[PDB]
Amino acid sequence: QNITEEFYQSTCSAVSKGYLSALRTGWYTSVITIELSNIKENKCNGTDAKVKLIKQELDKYKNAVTDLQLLMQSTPATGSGSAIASGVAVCKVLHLEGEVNKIKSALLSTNKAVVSLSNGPSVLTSKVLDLKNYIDKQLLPIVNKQSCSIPNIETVIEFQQKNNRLLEITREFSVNAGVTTPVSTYMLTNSELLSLINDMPITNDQKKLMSNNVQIVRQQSYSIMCIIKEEVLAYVVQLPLYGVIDTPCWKLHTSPLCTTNTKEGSNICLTRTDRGWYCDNAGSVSFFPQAETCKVQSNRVFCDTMNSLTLPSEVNLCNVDIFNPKYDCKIMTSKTDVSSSVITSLGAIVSCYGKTKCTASNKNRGIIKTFSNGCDYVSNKGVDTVSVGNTLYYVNKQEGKSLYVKGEPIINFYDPLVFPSNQFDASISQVNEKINQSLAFIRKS
Amino acid sequence: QNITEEFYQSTCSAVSKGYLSALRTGWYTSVITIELSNIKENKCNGTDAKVKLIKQELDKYKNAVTDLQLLMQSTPATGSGSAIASGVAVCKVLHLEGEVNKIKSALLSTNKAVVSLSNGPSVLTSKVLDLKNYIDKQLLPIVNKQSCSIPNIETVIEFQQKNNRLLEITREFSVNAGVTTPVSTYMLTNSELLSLINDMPITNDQKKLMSNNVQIVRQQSYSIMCIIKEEVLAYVVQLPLYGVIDTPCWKLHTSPLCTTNTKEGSNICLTRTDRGWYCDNAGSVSFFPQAETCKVQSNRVFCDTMNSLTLPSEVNLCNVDIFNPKYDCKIMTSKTDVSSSVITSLGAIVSCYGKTKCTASNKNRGIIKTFSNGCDYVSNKGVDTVSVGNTLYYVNKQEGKSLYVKGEPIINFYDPLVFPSNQFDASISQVNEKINQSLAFIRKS
Amino acid sequence: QNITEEFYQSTCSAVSKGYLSALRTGWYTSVITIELSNIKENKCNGTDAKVKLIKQELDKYKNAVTDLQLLMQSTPATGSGSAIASGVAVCKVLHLEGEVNKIKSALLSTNKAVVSLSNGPSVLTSKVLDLKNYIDKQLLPIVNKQSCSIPNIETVIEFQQKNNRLLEITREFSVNAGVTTPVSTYMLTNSELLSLINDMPITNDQKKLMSNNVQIVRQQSYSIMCIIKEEVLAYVVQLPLYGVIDTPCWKLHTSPLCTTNTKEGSNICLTRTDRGWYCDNAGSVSFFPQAETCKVQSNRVFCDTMNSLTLPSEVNLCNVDIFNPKYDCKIMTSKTDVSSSVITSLGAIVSCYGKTKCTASNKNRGIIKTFSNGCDYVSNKGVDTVSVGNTLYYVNKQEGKSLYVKGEPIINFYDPLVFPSNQFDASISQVNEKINQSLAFIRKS
């Protein structure tokens, strides 16, 4: 895939093109079970050091079970649960009489199995750990007699290893109120995640997509605690379904565009708004304003449509003609001429004002470009760093072509006296209407 | 408890009522000690594999102690320490001569004990781990001779288990500069937290409150590292005291309210401000603007009054009459007609504008409601999802009654030509004064 | 070092002086290697419990290696990688043919060694764990025969201890997409960090600085995963270089300054902007607007110049004469008279308006000061807490001198009718120009 960039000198903005999308649009919920042992404390006259170690690890198991019990009594309403609703609906089904018994029956002979619930949905269940078999077969003959039988040291170690995953899951669920994200390897192993991806009702190319970006899949997944009941600990893992694939995505970068007059206080500034990620989606454009809502791998963007706005496709015309009537291209105005830089995908935008020392250097050649007052841009081809004031930015060394689109900075088309200088989220046409109304008070005079 | 909702069509806002409060107003500090062993490295000609394992775990203990020492030399001033002041004041007392010796004496025979410090306060101390007894009784006869005695394999395992909590506490305190929140099970066990709640000078009903929401108590607690001195590692756990209980709490939801003219650029928008949590508190209302400052369980809100504003009780009249002179009901204005949705507690607000496809569906029936241009609302009774553009929101399936309060959208009472379209944090009466002043420039003409 | 404060009654702002700087200006990258064992699964008829435990831990090692392999295929472009560029450039060199073989040769006999790469830079390499020697010497004679040899129980335990660090590093790198910050003790031990500081090409006083603030150094460091290839797991640790040292730093605190008229809706408010940390840097001032970008220890501020603005040194004149023409001192305006408090370094600013109950108390004396309507200040000398409405703030008990600089609140110099009441990021002179233009519409009438 070819990554390209376009800096528009007229609007002090740059667009990084050539990225492919992966937008989350659905959820695939799955039930994860850990078969537990319903045991009560048993006392046999014991003093052997091995017996002591076993009883110690067994108390750590019983506290973990009671901790999971007090965790499942309190079921969280933290937030709008608008992104976990899919799994919360499964937990409400699991609380029905006979349903934990149902999953207990389907996973009686195999580890994984599809189960048709009574509410309806066809969930895929897994048995990832079997403590009921281990405690009842290897541990009860040790503690459930008049006098304790003596266990071998291999057993002490094997029980600390098996019980460890239960303890770590109780630790995470206790500090996070039953909802964890990302989903850790304790909640779901890479082997278990990959087998769960392979068993999903998705296309073969989409299974390849999730398997090559398992870390992004974990960051976009949730683990919700359901119930501990009748020797079963169940929790739902909610994995992302990417309904939008291989669509064009671009990233808009904006920087303040001011005039460069020599008398401070006589300068006016304009900045394009809505910087961030844009992706073509179902005849429209899905816009992502928060910076942390999109993880990028290679040329592919992984966004959650949960935190997007839906805009008309004409919003891209702000990149080719900011003055085009098909779309009201919004700006913000000020008189705050502070220098800054934006590291883009293939270069750097620099807004230099005042006495600020703006420059672009190569590690071995030194300063190769000095920016003047105004908004400018430099490609990463031959540039390693950019210094603005006392701050040094590193340029991304990604391969791609940059295009410098020359044009008059549009801030020069504005008369300063009638400029609206405190506008946040203003349209180009809105600013023009405030200027036409301010021109009428002068028309009479 | 009955959860109810009221959508006000006139102001594009909804109020979720019936929630009970738990506001944090005080702190209960407590001293947590780990009795350590003042040992220096001891060398005996040793090569036995068991002796090697013991010396390895002992070096991990000595590095943990030196790591805690370099952690306590640097005492943080990170932030205004305005919420840890209560515990920082105890750490300054612990540094006095004889005070670590005092706690060392009170916990000489029992694990928990109340101690009257020299500064004054009556703190409750605990001994959660005893490494001085274990290292000096089970380990020194092994390393403090000419030739090492041979330890049994149970001892190697018991020492890795006991030393583990010390190592994990040093790990958390090293990456977090001595202040951790929430308070982990390593800092304080659920058994230790529950016993600490039971031993607190609080009402019996309030102990029941903290014991049923231990995960929320952990998220609202702090663990502060004090000192390692004279075979004692001490750190203060600061637990929340909820001075406001069972008060009425409601959640205000707001969404943009625009006109629906057919020519873009001729539309004006209004949005109610100060969305969030409101709770009755001491004759006033405690308002919480940040979303993460309130954890909800069932019908109970758990807020920290540290991040609240105090407002007059007349602020609720913005919910019944936005035009009421007893309180200046604030709005923000714009010309940005972008579609969005808000998932409320019992339904969903939808602001639909332009060509956006807004709809509300049931999983098995399909589309059951199409929203028109404007601000509207749908209850969760029969609705599962709401789609706005390319985004799908899930509706909370919580039981409750919704009330649709019909009324003319107030944005229609405004003449567009004289509307103030860039107002952030503006009052209703403030906007009316800008309109009366803009009406005077037209009165003469 | 003497900490001092100055509250300016005229502008409702306070300045905390006497702090020394440590600004991050460079990066020191270092290569961290873990020598691994290229083994494939080996099967010998085995049933001994010790053999089973060893094969279990060996599968956990092989899954960790395959997990690191799928982690290094996906190389992240998450963000602008503008702060990890230095290490990402080293990872691209490590991928060259013969370079992992080069580091494998330089660390063949010693643990640490400086290596001149082919790209150029002179990196310092370390071998922190040696699994190739341990697996090939202690484990292969156990699994690579016709029938398995029987290992001793000390070996089972020693292998779970050595393999543990590899597993924890794979766990962190899997959930964080190869880039972790802060740098944990698993990524780099305190002993390894301190030895790495001692071996750095920095001044001896600067090594003392980083060694006494290792927790701040970890919070300002990055760990980047490079490659697993040819029995080598390599990742770069990027440590901060503090180019600005012992410079003057002050903290600006601002609070709303309103008029105290008795009729609500007739009041105007002004607040100084750009609150935060200021440090002298290279003839200018480095300003830090985000609150979490500066960690404070004692009297020293540790900032990253990556998130700073560079301002002229005349910006300090807003603290002595807000009306001074050398610098355009910016304010924001509103009519939102909401009470609040700011805990400063040596006292507290209180903006009290309306019916709000503002007070300052001592724990044992009770209320010692009642604030009137307006903006006021109290030193921490004799004050423990400050209550504003239903909120109680704790005052920092740091030793220092406070100075109350009396002056007329400048909001009283403004005629309310012509005040600009919706100004964000406005200069003093900008507001005066809007008043001169609004005075001309009245001049004719």
Ligand SMILES: *[C@@H]1O[C@H](CO)[C@@H](O)[C@H](O)[C@H]1NC(C)=O
């Ligand atoms: C300003 O007036 C001119 C006509 O004189 C018109 O072409 C233009 O569209 C107007 N702009 C706005 C924003 O109303």
Ligand SMILES: *[C@@H]1O[C@H](CO)[C@@H](O)[C@H](O)[C@H]1NC(C)=O
């Ligand atoms: C506008 O003027 C009318 C009187 O003509 C008055 O009733 C109203 O309160 C005024 N509004 C403001 C905000 O001053």
Ligand SMILES: *[C@@H]1O[C@H](CO)[C@@H](O)[C@H](O)[C@H]1NC(C)=O
């Ligand atoms: C306002 O006018 C006076 C002269 O009458 C001048 O001294 C002052 O600088 C002007 N202020 C601005 C902001 O233009």
